[PDB]
């Protein structure tokens, strides 16, 4: 969205051809305009026929029709039920608080309906005590109870809320924001079920994917934020089993970026299943598609059998006669390399990667997968299943193909992931705070002026919440240097606030500054 949005076009020209003489705001938004000896004082109300006012107000509902009130709706603290506040209170370790706010929202809506009062009377803070937002830790939250008919947030309250939110239009919320609020209710319902199993980097990932499902129109794969939430979770098995139902095809194992974070011991099984599916696609049986998954696993024999049973395919006779050889033989190794480089010139990139993997030249299979096929997701998967979980070919691939673009794009999620897969944990944790161009002589990769800068560098509060997690688990790497680390923690805390404040979550900014623990 633009940082500024027009809300009125005071068109004095519609009455006189004389140019505006002078313009001056005054008390309560009164905008006095002068021309000749003749003033055009406009009050702070709004004319809904204007295209600017109509577009800025959008679908919202506002108590007063004012430029002052409108400018206090498009900006300023969020109502505590706003979806952008609830997801940000979930990313911060305040899930219990979000559950309580949803319960209070239900109670307030029932109160309004029972008294037949208009919903616009709904309290923005839902009668919450502000100190609740400042509680340092999720398990220290005083989760009080309510009267018997609905004592604590649960499935019944969830369904009642999802009904009410369709039977009423919450104030200040564009209908799309209300849809995302309903999806947040569903996500909290899911988390409450899994809340007893997955640590809280599992809860953040679960909400990330549940929000992804509602935005497949504009979002083509879970952000690297969610991949990094899951990558550092201790319960990757639970997350994978929760999103498994959606991973039927490779195109859906590439949306959830499973190759990045799922455990190698599950990535092997997922390649087996994805090979099964990719073979028996909608069209017909074709061992060409599932070749890479079966070779990466080192199951050339299954691929050979697959080619054999594919009697109808035109390529069958050549491939059965070729693949059956033993590619430890130098002559056949060179023959397979030659065929791989021929297929790279006949524009058959996937087959070139397959052949480059027959001979165990992984460094050439993964470079054909990430550079000519454009699947870094599949390259990482093949690296992780074929050779091992972390490096050595994966390290070179990431440092060559991903690190430069990450530095140019100034992306710190990718940089942290890369320095994690290189098992450079001590600097992988630091890459979350300091920009990639300043890490490990990365300035040698690209000139500092080529990198993105200016307003495009919008912070990401979650990026800090991850650090405070890793920083606390990997203290061994931070005891050696405290003053230098604090010098940048105290900068990124004040730069993460001032976006938590610019995105309306002031209550979370105060919590972040209040509760941050400096490692003395």
């Amino acid at each position: 969205t633009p940082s500024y949005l027009p809300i009125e076009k005071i068109d004095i020209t519609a009455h006189t051809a004389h140019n505006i003489g002078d313009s001056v705001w005054m008390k309560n938004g009164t905008f006095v305009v002068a021309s000749g000896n003749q003033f055009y004082i406009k009050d702070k109300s709004l004319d809904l026929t204007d295209p600017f006012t109509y577009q800025s107000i959008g679908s919202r509902k506002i108590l007063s029709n004012d430029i002052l009130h409108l400018s206090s709706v498009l900006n300023g603290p969020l109502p505590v039920y706003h979806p952008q506040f609830l997801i940000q209170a979930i990313y911060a370790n305040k899930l219990q608080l979000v559950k309580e706010l949803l319960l209070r929202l239900f109670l307030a809506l029932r109160k309004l309906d029972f008294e037949s009062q208009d919903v616009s009377n709904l309290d923005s803070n839902l009668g919450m005590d502000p100190l609740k937002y400042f509680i340092a830790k999720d398990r220290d939250y005083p989760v009080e109870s309510f009267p018997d008919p609905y004592p604590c947030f649960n499935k019944t309250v969830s369904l009642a809320l999802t009904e009410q939110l369709t039977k009423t239009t919450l104030p200040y919320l564009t209908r799309h924001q209300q849809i995302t609020l309903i999806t947040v209710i569903e996500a909290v319902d899911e988390v409450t079920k899994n809340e007893n199993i997955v640590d809280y980097n599992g809860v953040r990932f679960l909400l990330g994917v549940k929000l992804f499902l509602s935005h497949k129109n504009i979002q083509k794969s879970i952000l690297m934020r969610d991949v990094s939430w899951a990558l550092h979770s201790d319960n990757k098995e639970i997350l994978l089993s929760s999103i498994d139902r959606h991973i039927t095809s490779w195109n859906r194992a590439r949306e959830y970026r499973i190759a990045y974070w799922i455990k190698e011991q599950d990535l092997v099984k997922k390649f087996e299943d994805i090979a099964k599916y990719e073979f028996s696609k909608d069209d017909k049986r074709d061992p060409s598609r599932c070749a890479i998954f079966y070779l990466a696993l080192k199951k050339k024999q299954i691929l050979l059998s697959l080619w054999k049973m594919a009697i109808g395919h035109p390529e069958q006779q050549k491939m059965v006669r070729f693949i059956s050889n033993d590619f430890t033989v130098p002559r056949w190794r060179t023959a397979a390399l030659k065929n791989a480089f021929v297929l790279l010139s006949k524009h058959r990139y996937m087959d070139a990667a397959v052949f480059f993997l027959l001979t165990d030249s992984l460094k050439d299979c993964v470079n054909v997968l990430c550079k000519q096929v454009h699947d870094m997701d599949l390259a990482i998967g093949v690296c992780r299943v074929y050779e091992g979980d972390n490096g050595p070919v994966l390290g070179e691939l990431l440092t060559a193909q991903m690190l430069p673009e990450t530095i140019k794009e100034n992306d710190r999620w990718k940089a942290s992931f890369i320095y994690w897969k290189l098992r450079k944990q001590e600097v992988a944790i630091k890459a979350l705070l300091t920009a990639p161009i300043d890490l490990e002589n990365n300035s040698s990769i690209v000139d500092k002026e080529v990198c993105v800068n200016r307003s495009f560098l919008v912070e990401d509060p979650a990026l800090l919440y991850l650090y405070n997690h890793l920083r606390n688990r990997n203290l061994k790497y931070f005891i050696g240097s405290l003053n230098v680390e604090a010098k940048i923690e105290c900068t990124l805390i004040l730069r993460v606030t001032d976006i938590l404040c610019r995105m309306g979550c002031n209550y979370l900014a105060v919590s972040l500054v209040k509760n941050w623990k400096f490692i003395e």
Binding site: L344, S345, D364
Partner: protein
């Protein structure tokens, strides 16, 4: 085939100066600005397409009545003074072709 071990920078090079080094199976090969090809072996292509664009000569009869396409094969039988060579040269002059190989 192979992995570019070295690629020359922009500048003026004679045909004999090395321009590229490429390693395949640990063996390094050197490539200049030219290469030799057996004239009796056809040069490979990824796939053979279907010729669908006209070979617009300058001749009304050949363009309208008996058109040829880019990538087609045509023959011009005739006696010893009916213009097989004048047609050939007019085509070499005014055809759409980006390059002409005139074989006598």
């Amino acid at each position: 085939r192979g992995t570019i071990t070295w690629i020359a920078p922009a500048g003026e090079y004679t045909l004999d100066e090395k321009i590229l080094e490429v390693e395949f199976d640990g063996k390094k090969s050197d490539f200049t600005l030219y290469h030799t090809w057996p004239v009796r072996v056809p040069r490979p292509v990824t796939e053979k397409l279907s010729a669908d664009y006209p070979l617009l000569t300058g001749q009304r009869v050949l363009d309208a009545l008996f058109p040829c396409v880019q990538g087609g094969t045509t023959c011009i039988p005739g006696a010893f003074g009916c213009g097989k060579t004048v047609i050939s040269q007019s085509l070499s002059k005014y055809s759409n072709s980006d390059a002409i190989i005139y074989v006598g």
